[PDB]
Design a protein around this ligand. Structure first.
Ligand SMILES: Cc1ncc(COP(=O)(O)O)c(CNOC[C@H]2CCNC2)c1O
Ligand SMILES: Cc1ncc(COP(=O)(O)O)c(CNOC[C@H]2CCNC2)c1O
Lengths: 406, 411
């Protein structure tokens, strides 16, 4: 089974070269299903980079971003924590041998039976942001260590009047007092700035707000020690606001509001940072139409779409950039083109308009940075199966993973 | 009510005097004093049989080929196969599903106009001869991978009033249709008919008339080039519930005179359709549990309810199918009871996983149930397990008389 099958990446070869090779091998096979190449070594590189940029912050990987068992196994060997949102994710993490103290149940609104599942399996730390959640915890997991999730302002959000998660400071005070009444232990504070962060100062504000709630806890008699700064960090360099800019703004704020001598323990919940760039998707052009506007335009149909990997266009506000597998000659002509998914849906369209050389059925298109919120949310609408994932890892990357295990 | 063994093929008896609603009530009452309150469906296969009887009555000249993609539940396909419908399959997996249930290939149309070559090869290997197409490259692929196929030319329609527009993506113009027929003649490929799709969620029935007229024209084009055209495929778009402005019978009352005018029976034409949501929409009712609750003060009281199904699950139809969902209470509320402005949210971490932005509901509590009717079409077929949340259990029910009706259809 390919789930736990990993291939060697030879010296001097990158995931890109492996992609080229696999494509050339099937040139006349006629079996040209879409497929992923996933470089686990890129995940190890991301971990080293995190250790360098955020030395005070323990990463808890957000399983929901991509729950591939190979990914979770690699990260567990690396020694990260895991942020789990449901019973199934907890089951996945524990099946790989991760002890419960490396799991945070960071879902603020949890079904009671799933809270009980967490309690049965020793997962003690959970987040919350409402009084009803406190009632549920008191009845189903009374010895849990609760982390109060506070609200953060996203000025760019589509729905700004109705925020799904996060308590205001005013509500946070009442929640701390209520938890004290119910004899429930609150041990920290969490927040989530969001993937669509444009200004790193948002983090500063969140950290400042977190400190405020910490002070409230001290007033009510809690011994607060856990600060969870959430996720939202970029997973590729193809972004305006790069990881290191964010961390360069975060670390002084952490030192100012949560100095190390205070005894605070700082964690994060990065999802896309670890996995986005590790996965590259190859889709095959399965159909083609030429529309005359005599300026020629083209419609290409590929065998992955908005019901599959490209659901990220709708759910994750993703902007995907098609890349050519075979290097184009410098002089060849480009045409206005659209790219469509395989399903019956007229809205199953990947790219409305782009410039491409004339391509043919059987040619491949590549999409980089497809690791995050792509396969995790794919469906089998129309009966189309999920692309196979080929995991690769070089020898030196495996050695680095061994060093992390030691 | 509890499934034992396989969910797919387990069916429960629906006793005399009971409706699917009563089964929902019973299931809810049965788990009233426990903490396992996962979301679940009640699927009344008898409603599907009723829909088939209604179709036979309203469109006696049109053989239905069920659009498997709308809801690919094995129980649904088995019931319809026993009923004797055809099947419209969009991929190798759907063909596999239909054939596994024992349906012969002549009751399958591969009505995907833009097919991967290996899937065309699969269709050829398993005797599925009839496929649609709307482009020259498709003719090349068929000539190379399925040369003996019977092709149905899919034409464009003005579906501007339809809820789900398909014509931007699929369908040849009449001008293109002439060239496609001539090209098919060059390649020695047999074109046997014409198909169209007015668009899912049709709002104006006159579209069908024009579509049928266009089909007649293409038929005539085929006759000019030497094809003997006999198959007319009028697609889908029919409503699946009575909760719509444009009801099934108005559409069929517009379709039947057009069929008689442009395709009289004495011509030898064979007329089929590809209804998806018509057969299954109202057969499924979804019950979700309120798993979390927040009170927001405006003191005008407002409420946020969190349930254990969402936009990544069954309610993906809000995004993909332009669905407008109406939450229903298990017990019809007393007239005097106070209502509050309320929002309904899915279980996932996503801030946009929101089912209902604003509605009026009495104050509800964790453990209460909400019902969503007419959830059969384009709901489970496109659900994912994002965040690790599992698909709702489906409980299939069927009364004795419904089974008798199915037996009559099978004979
Ligand atoms: C509570 C919590 N923790 C971590 C993450 C992961 O965020 P990343 O940006 O680092 O991956 C999340 C993510 N929550 O929502 C992001 C969704 C919204 C659309 N697709 C991604 C989280 O909620
Ligand atoms: C070719 C073809 N045949 C039948 C159907 C079924 O249409 P119904 O309206 O009868 O269910 C279709 C539908 N195709 O896309 C409609 C999807 C898109 C979003 N949700 C519905 C079809 O294409």
């Amino acid at each position: 089974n390919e789930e736990f099958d990993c291939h060697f990446l030879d010296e001097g070869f990158t995931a890109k070269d492996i992609l080229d090779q696999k494509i050339n091998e099937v040139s006349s096979s006629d079996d040209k299903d879409a497929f992923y190449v996933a470089d686990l070594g890129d995940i190890l590189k991301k971990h080293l980079r995190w250790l360098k940029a955020l030395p005070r912050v323990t990463p808890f990987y957000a399983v929901k971003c991509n729950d591939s068992k190979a990914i979770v196994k690699t990260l567990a060997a690396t020694g990260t924590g895991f942020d789990c949102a449901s019973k199934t994710e907890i089951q996945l993490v524990q099946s790989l041998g991760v002890p419960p103290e490396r799991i945070i149940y960071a879902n603020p609104c949890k079904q009671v039976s799933q809270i009980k599942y967490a309690a049965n399996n020793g997962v003690q730390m959970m987040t919350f942001d409402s009084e009803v959640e406190l009632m549920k915890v008191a009845r189903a997991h009374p010895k849990a260590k609760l982390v109060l999730r506070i609200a953060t302002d996203d000025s760019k959000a589509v729905c700004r009047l109705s925020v799904k998660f996060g308590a205001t400071l005013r509500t946070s005070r009442l929640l701390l007092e209520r938890a004290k009444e119910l004899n429930i232990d609150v041990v920290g504070v969490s927040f989530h700035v969001g993937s669509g962060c444009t200004d790193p100062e948002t983090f500063v504000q969140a950290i400042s707000d977190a400190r405020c709630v910490f002070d409230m806890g001290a007033e009510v008699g809690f011994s607060m020690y856990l600060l969870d700064i959430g996720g939202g960090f970029p997973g590729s360099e193809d972004v305006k606001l790069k990881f290191e800019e964010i961390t360069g703004v975060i670390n002084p704020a952490l030192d100012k509001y949560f100095p190390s001598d205070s005894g605070v323990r700082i964690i994060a919940e990065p999802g896309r940072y670890y996995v986005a760039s590790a996965f590259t998707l190859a889709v095959n052009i399965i159909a083609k139409k030429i529309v005359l506007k005599s300026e020629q335009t083209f419609m290409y149909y590929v065998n992955d779409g908005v019901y599959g990997s490209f659901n990220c266009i709708l759910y994750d506000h993703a902007h995907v950039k098609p890349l050519l597998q075979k290097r184009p000659k410098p002089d060849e002509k480009y045409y206005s083109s659209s790219i469509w998914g395989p399903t019956c849906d007229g809205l199953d369209r990947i790219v409305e308009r782009c410039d491409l050389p004339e391509m043919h059925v059987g040619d491949w298109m590549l999409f980089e940075n497809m690791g995050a919120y792509t396969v995790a949310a794919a469906s089998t609408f129309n009966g189309f199966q999920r692309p196979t994932i080929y995991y690769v890892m070089s020898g030196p990357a495996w050695q680095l993973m061994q060093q992390f295990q030691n």
